[PDB]
Structure formats: structure tokens, C-alpha cells
């Protein structure tokens, strides 16, 4: 479903306040601490044997910045989410072999990271607009698993 003008104002106005470098590093560290098995997809980043290693691993920190920077391009393409992420869907399927069920779990972690960093902006209605965005980005990333 397309974003109404109310949804569009919540998303666009909060994303202007987000520190994308910090929140992305936070979300990827949380994904690898809350789901420790998924480290399998990132073993080439080196030391990740426990939460302290993960939080000080710089390859994890930089990967998190790029992932959330990529998610943040959805805010400029709210009417074309499926079409914007088609190349990146195909790479997660054919190259990284990542189960498309995992896109929802990272999306749910991003919502928690945003809630913690912006407690007064993340109202019930702001949260609902962001959950709709994470649902659509997850679906778009799952869409070229042919």
C-alpha cells in the first residue's frame, strides 16, 4: 500500500534527524548479538566470538553504516521501493545466499534502534508508519529470489 501524506511526513521528518552511521552500526551489532548464528554470513569480518568482540569489530561497524544508508534510500523512493531494491534482492539471493525471512528480523531491530535514539519522535503513529516502511523494504529485498 502507498504511503499517505501523514505516513510520508512521519518518515521523512524523522529520517532527517537520524545519525545513520551510529544507528546502522547499532542495528547490525544487535542483529549478531540477538541471533548469534547469523555470524555465519559475516565470518570474513574476523573476531565475533562474543558481544564485546562484535561491538569493537570495525568491519561490523562499517557494514552497518552501509546497510542503514541503503535502507535510508527508501525514504527518497517511497513510491518505488520494490523497483529500487531489485538489484540488491538479486545479490542477497545469488551471491550471499541469505534466507529472505531474515529481512524482517533486521527491520524489527532497526525499529528498536530508532525508538531508543529518538524516544520523543517515536510516537504510536510514527512507529506505525515506520513498521509499514520496514515491511515494504523486507518484501522488496525478498522479491528477486527466482
Amino acid at each position: 500500500a502507498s504511503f499517505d501524506a501523514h505516513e510520508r511526513k512521519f518518515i521523512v521528518d524523522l529520517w532527517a534527524k537520524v545519525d545513520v552511521a551510529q544507528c546502522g552500526a547499532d542495528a547490525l551489532s544487535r542483529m549478531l548479538i540477538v541471533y548469534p548464528w547469523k555470524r555465519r554470513y559475516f565470518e570474513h569480518f574476523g573476531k565475533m566470538c562474543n558481544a564485546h568482540d562484535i561491538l569493537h569489530n570495525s568491519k561490523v561497524q562499517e557494514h552497518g553504516k552501509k546497510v542503514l544508508a541503503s535502507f535510508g534510500e527508501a525514504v527518497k523512493h517511497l513510491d518505488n521501493i520494490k523497483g529500487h531494491f531489485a538489484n540488491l534482492s538479486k545479490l542477497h539471493c545469488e551471491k550471499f545466499h541469505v534466507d529472505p525471512e531474515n529481512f524482517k528480523l533486521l527491520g524489527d531491530i532497526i525499529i528498536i534502534v530508532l525508538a531508543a535514539h529518538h524516544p520523543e519522535d517515536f510516537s504510536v503513529e510514527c512507529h506505525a508508519a515506520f513498521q509499514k516502511l520496514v515491511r515494504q523494504v523486507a518484501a522488496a529485498l525478498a522479491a528477486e529470489y527466482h
Binding site: 551489532s29 544487535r30 548479538i33 540477538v34 558481544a51 562484535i54 561491538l55 524489527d108 525499529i111 528498536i112 525508538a115 531508543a116 535514539h117 524516544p119 517515536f122 504510536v124 503513529e125 512507529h127 506505525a128 513498521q131
Partner: protein, 141 residues
């Protein structure tokens, strides 16, 4: 299932919920209803307005049940049997909805206690809510 570190992590974050079971419980139901509006099919009798007396009263009940589960974290199947039969047989609430609420509960803690809900505590609290959700689901099939 839960480690001794998970159990102490869960008892620590939950002590911050003490004194705010109605307030935190009410906000987590308001978040579930707005972000996952399909969940309103189970509450056709409720006023769905903000800080509705019925939402306050149900929020207190859910968080009180979670408070008792933290106290009896060693035997969740025995602490939650009465609720397990209510959810899984009388209301027949589908398992995916429990995931939606556990996520709204994690957002409420993150909003009110950002620093307390560290990545390690987040990991433990997610694990505890999944376990609580599985006892309320164990006879739904």
C-alpha cells in the same frame, strides 16, 4: 532454554518496569493495534481510543502476567497454564500475533529505558518473550 545470565538480565530490565505496569502495558497494546491493525479482530468490544479505560485495564493484566513469569522464570510452563488454555483454546489466537506483541513490548522498554536495554539485555529479553509466547501457544495446533 534460558541461561543463568539470561535469567538475571531479564530480572534486571523488568525491575525498571516496576511501578509502571499499567502505563507500559497500555502503551504496548496501543503500539500493537496501530502497527499491526489485524490484531484488532480479537478486541471487537474495546474502545480503541488512546488511554481508553479498557486498554489501560488489559495492559495492566498482560504486564502483571509477565511480572509473574519473571518471578517463575525457572518453570514458565507451570506459571502460565491458565493463560495457555485461554489463549490456545478459548480465543484461538494465531501464533504470529504473539511475535507482534513481543516486538511492541521491546519498543516500550527501548523508549523508556534506552541505556538499560543494551544489546546483551535485548538478546535475553527477546529470548524470554519467545519462551512465554511458546507456553501460550503450546496447545493451539
Amino acid at each position: 532454554v534460558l541461561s543463568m545470565e539470561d535469567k538475571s538480565n531479564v530480572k534486571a530490565i523488568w525491575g525498571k518496569a516496576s511501578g509502571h505496569l499499567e502505563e507500559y502495558g497500555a502503551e504496548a497494546l496501543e503500539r500493537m493495534f496501530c502497527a499491526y491493525p489485524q490484531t484488532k479482530i480479537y478486541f471487537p468490544h474495546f474502545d480503541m481510543s488512546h488511554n481508553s479505560a479498557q486498554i489501560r485495564a488489559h495492559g495492566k493484566k498482560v504486564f502483571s502476567a509477565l511480572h509473574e513469569a519473571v518471578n517463575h522464570i525457572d518453570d514458565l510452563p507451570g506459571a502460565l497454564c491458565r493463560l495457555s488454555e485461554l489463549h490456545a483454546h478459548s480465543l484461538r489466537v494465531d501464533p504470529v500475533n504473539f511475535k507482534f506483541l513481543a516486538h511492541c513490548v521491546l519498543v516500550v522498554f527501548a523508549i523508556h529505558h534506552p541505556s538499560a536495554l543494551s544489546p546483551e539485555i535485548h538478546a535475553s529479553l527477546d529470548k524470554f518473550l519467545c519462551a512465554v509466547s511458546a507456553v501460550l501457544t503450546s496447545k493451539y495446533r
